[PDB]
Amino acid sequence: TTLLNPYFGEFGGMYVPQILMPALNQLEEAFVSAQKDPEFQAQFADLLKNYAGRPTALTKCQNITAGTRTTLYLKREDLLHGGAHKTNQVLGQALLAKRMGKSEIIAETGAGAHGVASALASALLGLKCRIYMGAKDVERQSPNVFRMRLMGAEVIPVHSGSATLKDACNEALRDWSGSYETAHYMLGTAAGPHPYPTIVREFQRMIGEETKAQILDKEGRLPDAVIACVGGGSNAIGMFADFINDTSVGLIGVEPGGHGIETGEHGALLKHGRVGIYFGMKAPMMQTADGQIEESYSISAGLDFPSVGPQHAYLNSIGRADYVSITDDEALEAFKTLCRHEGIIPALESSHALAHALKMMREQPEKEQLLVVNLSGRGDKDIFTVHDILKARGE
Amino acid sequence: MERYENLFAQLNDRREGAFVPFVTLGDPGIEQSLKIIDTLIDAGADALELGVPFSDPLADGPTIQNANLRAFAAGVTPAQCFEMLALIREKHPTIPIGLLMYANLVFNNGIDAFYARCEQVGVDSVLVADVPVEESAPFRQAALRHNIAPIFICPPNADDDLLRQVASYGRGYTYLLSLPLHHLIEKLKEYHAAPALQGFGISSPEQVSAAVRAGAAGAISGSAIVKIIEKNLASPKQMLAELRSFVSAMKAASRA
Ligand SMILES: *Cc1c(COP(=O)(O)O)cnc(C)c1O
Ligand SMILES: [Cl-]
Ligand SMILES: [Cl-]
Ligand SMILES: [Cl-]
Ligand SMILES: [Cl-]
Ligand SMILES: [Cl-]
Ligand SMILES: [Cl-]
Ligand SMILES: [Cl-]
Ligand SMILES: [Cs+]
Ligand SMILES: [Cs+]
C-alpha cells in the first residue's frame, strides 16, 4: 500500500527487494507530511533563496536569434550555487532526511555533479555523507572527486559490474537496505523507485514556476515551448511540471544522440530503448537483446544515464511532451555559439537543449516562436573536453 | 509437478530438514558448473537454488557479484543457462529446482514466455529478487499458469501485513531472511504459508541444525558454496572435493 500512485501510466513502480520497501514507504510518508508542513516549506524556501541564490535569472538572448522571428530566453540554473540545477533537490532531500531523524546521507554519482551537490548539502546541514562512484568514473572525474572530499564527504569507488554509474547505483541500494534507520539515500535524478521520481520533480518544480512568472512579467503570455535536456530527467521535469496543465505550451525533452542514433552510441532511450525493469522502475533501458543493462554514451558525462525517468516515458506515451535527440557535434556547436554570442559558457548537457532550440529557429527562421531553454548548468567543467576535441579536429 | 510438496512430505517422514545450496549457473564456466551441481546433488543437496548471471544483481553481496562476473567472463548467457537447466532436470527427476532471477531477465522477452520456458525445462520455483510482493501480481500469475511456485522473501524487517501476503501468495517454500525468529516461523505456519527455509548466514552445520530446531523446514546456503568455488578456481579437482565435503557435512546437520 502507498499513499501516492507509484506509476505514471504503465511506467514507474517500486521494483526493489522486499527488504527496502519499508525504507521507501517511510520516505513517501515523510514527503507527504513535509509537503503539507508550512514550516518545512519555509525552511526549504530559506535555503533556496539565502544559500543557493533563488530565484535564478531568466535571460533574453538577443544576439543568437538576430534576424529570425524566434525570441529565446534561458532559465539560468547555471547561476545556482554549485552551478547546476541539482542543488535545488539535494537541499529538499537533505531536509527530508533531517525530518526523518537521519544523520547520514548516501548518494550515487557518475559525472560527479550529483556527488558534489549531495556533499555540499550535507556539509551545510551537518549530515555525514558517503558517495558511491564506479572506479572508472573516479579515475575520469578527479576534479569532482576532490570537491566532494573537500566538503568532507567519503568517496567510495565501486569495482563491481562495469565500474560505472549503474554499478554505483546498485551499491548505494545495497548499503541503504542495511542502513536506512540512520541514513537517507539521496537519489540523484527523477528516476528510481517511487517515491523518488515524484519527490525529485516536486523539489525541482520551482524552475518552471519561476519561469512561468518571469515570462508572464516580461512577455505577457506563456512560452510556445520549454526545452530541456534529459539524462535521468530531473531538470526537464522541473521545468515542465508547472506547464503540464497549460496545454498550449510545448514540452520538449532533448536526449543525447552521442555519435548519432544510427551508430548505437547514444543515450536516447525514449524512442530507442526497450522498456525494462531496473533501477527500481519500469522504464526504457539501454540493454542487450537478452536483457543485460548496458552503458549509454554522450560527449556530456551528465547525460550518460542508461534509462530515463518514468514520468517522461508517460508524458511521451500520451503525447503531452515531445522528445528529440541532439548529437555530440550539434551540442558542441551550440556550446561555441552561446560562448561567443552571449558570453555564457553552458554545460555540455544544457548545450543539447540549446542546440535543439537553435535548430527550431534555423530550420524555420520566419516562424514566430517564444522559446525557453532550461540552462541546467554552467560549462566551466567542459572547457578541457571542448579544447581537446577542437585541437584534434584541427581548430 | 509437485516437487517441493513431495520433498517436504518425505523429509517430514524422516524428521529431517532440507539443505539447499545456491550457485550461479555457468560459474566458473558451463562444463564446470554442470559438474559442480551434480556434485552438490550427489553429496546430499535436497533441492537447488540457481542464479542466472545478470549485469546488475542489486540484491546480492560481493561473493555473488563476483560469481556473476566469472560467468560473464565465460560468455554465459540466459539462453545457455536454460540449456543447462534442461540438462540438469533430465539427469535428476525429483530434486526441486528453484531459480533466483532479476526482474529484467524475466520481463525482457515477456513474463509469460519466461515462465513457459521455465516449465519446459522443468524448473519448480522462481524467486525474483527485486520484485516485492506489492509488485508481484503479474509474476505470480504467470508462474502459477505454468506450474511454477513464486517464492517470496520474508525479511528481518517484516510486519504482520507482509506475513499475511507472503503466506497467501508464495508457494513451494517461504524464503526467510533473519519479532524473534520463532514468532515469524510460528506466524507463517498460522497463516498456512509455504514451509520456511532459513536463508540468512547459513555457512556451517550448526546453523542448519539451529534453523531446523527453530521450526523451519530447512536452510539455504546463500553464498558459502560460491565461496568454495571462488577459493578453488585454480584447481577444479579440489574444488569438487571441497564442495562434496561441505555439502555432506551440511546435509548431515539437517538429519533427525
Ligand atoms: C545532472 C545534470 C543533467 C542531467 O540530469 P537530469 O536529471 O536529466 O537533469 C543535465 N544538466 C546538468 C547541468 C546536470 O548537472
Ligand atoms: Cl584534482
Ligand atoms: Cl538500518
Ligand atoms: Cl510587466
Ligand atoms: Cl539505435
Ligand atoms: Cl524499441
Ligand atoms: Cl567450465
Ligand atoms: Cl516443473
Ligand atoms: Cs529575434
Ligand atoms: Cs535519457
Side-chain angles (χ1 to χ4, degrees), chain A residues 43-356:
Chain A
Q43 283 178 55
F44 186 25
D46 180 13
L47 296 180
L48 294 167
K49 170 180 194 180
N50 293 308
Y51 177 79
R54 297 211 74 83
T56 66
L58 183 74
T59 304
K60 187 179 163 192
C61 288
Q62 279 169 208
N63 296 328
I64 209 170
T65 65
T68 79
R69 299 199 175 291
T70 290
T71 296
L72 176 62
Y73 286 81
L74 307 186
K75 184 50 173 171
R76 296 295 300 286
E77 290 307 290
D78 61 304
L79 298 183
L80 202 63
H81 179 54
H85 68 293
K86 288 185 174 62
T87 295
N88 297 311
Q89 74 99 5
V90 294
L91 289 169
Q93 279 203 65
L95 289 184
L96 273 188
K98 285 180 96 162
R99 184 181 190 88
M100 292 188 289
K102 311 283 168 96
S103 72
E104 309 196 342
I105 295 293
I106 303 155
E108 79 287 348
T109 195
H114 180 62
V116 175
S118 297
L120 59 89
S122 287
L124 172 72
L125 295 159
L127 301 167
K128 201 171 80 207
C129 175
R130 56 190 179 274
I131 296 151
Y132 288 99
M133 190 175 187
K136 281 187 215 157
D137 288 325
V138 169
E139 277 306 279
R140 280 202 287 260
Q141 299 300 348
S142 287
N144 280 333
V145 171
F146 186 59
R147 289 180 169 96
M148 290 176 243
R149 290 176 171 158
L150 279 164
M151 289 165 161
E154 178 186 12
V155 171
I156 307 168
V158 173
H159 294 275
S160 55
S162 62
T164 66
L165 171 65
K166 67 175 182 65
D167 313 289
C169 280
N170 305 332
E171 197 70 7
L173 291 182
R174 291 174 190 115
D175 180 338
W176 197 40
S177 69
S179 60
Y180 71 92
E181 297 178 353
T182 61
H184 174 61
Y185 172 40
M186 187 180 270
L187 208 164
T189 191
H194 174 77
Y196 282 100
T198 294
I199 294 175
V200 171
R201 183 187 61 237
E202 291 297 308
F203 288 172
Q204 284 298 356
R205 78 173 295 118
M206 62 292 307
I207 298 174
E209 285 161 358
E210 285 175 9
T211 295
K212 170 182 299 176
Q214 289 169 309
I215 200 86
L216 284 175
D217 176 66
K218 298 174 175 307
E219 294 289 337
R221 54 173 283 221
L222 295 174
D224 297 312
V226 299
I227 307 150
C229 72
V230 174
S234 71
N235 85 91
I237 205 74
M239 177 56 87
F240 290 180
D242 206 55
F243 294 108
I244 285 165
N245 291 351
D246 301 295
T247 56
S248 79
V249 175
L251 313 176
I252 304 171
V254 182
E255 297 186 283
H259 297 310
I261 296 312
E262 74 295 341
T263 71
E265 292 301 307
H266 62 88
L269 295 159
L270 280 162
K271 294 179 201 46
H272 306 103
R274 292 188 291 119
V275 176
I277 299 177
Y278 172 62
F279 292 126
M281 64 178 180
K282 185 182 288 172
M285 297 286 159
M286 189 65 77
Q287 60 173 313
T288 66
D290 61 358
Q292 307 297 354
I293 311 291
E294 293 194 285
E295 288 174 64
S296 51
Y297 162 76
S298 181
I299 190 177
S300 178
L303 292 192
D304 205 327
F305 171 70
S307 183
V308 62
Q311 188 167 8
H312 291 294
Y314 173 68
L315 287 170
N316 185 42
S317 78
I318 68 168
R320 170 75 188 95
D322 298 298
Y323 297 80
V324 301
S325 62
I326 283 288
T327 66
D328 287 356
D329 284 347
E330 289 174 320
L332 284 156
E333 179 265 315
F335 176 105
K336 292 187 291 155
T337 295
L338 194 71
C339 283
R340 166 184 286 286
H341 296 290
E342 299 294 342
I344 303 168
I345 309 181
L348 280 175
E349 296 84 346
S350 315
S351 294
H352 287 74
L354 183 60
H356 185 74

Side-chain angles (χ1 to χ4, degrees), chain A residues 1 6-7 12-23 25 159-162 166-167 170-171 173-174 177 180 274-280 282 285 287-294, chain B residues 52-61 65 69 72 76-79 102-105 107-109 111 129-135 138-139 152-158 162 165-166 177:
Chain A
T1 308
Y7 282 92
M14 304 167 79
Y15 293 94
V16 292
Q18 196 71 55
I19 191 165
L20 272 177
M21 290 297 292
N25 287 331
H159 294 275
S160 55
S162 62
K166 67 175 182 65
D167 313 289
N170 305 332
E171 197 70 7
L173 291 182
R174 291 174 190 115
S177 69
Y180 71 92
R274 292 188 291 119
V275 176
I277 299 177
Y278 172 62
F279 292 126
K282 185 182 288 172
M285 297 286 159
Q287 60 173 313
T288 66
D290 61 358
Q292 307 297 354
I293 311 291
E294 293 194 285
Chain B
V52 170
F54 180 54
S55 58
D56 292 86
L58 65 92
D60 279 292
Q65 296 163 23
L69 287 170
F72 286 117
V76 170
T77 58
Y102 284 89
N104 201 53
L105 290 187
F107 177 86
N108 182 54
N109 198 56
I111 291 171
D130 53 346
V131 176
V133 296
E134 296 85 345
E135 284 290 4
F139 298 85
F152 294 97
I153 287 175
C154 182
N157 57 9
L162 181 61
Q165 280 180 84
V166 161
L177 264 201

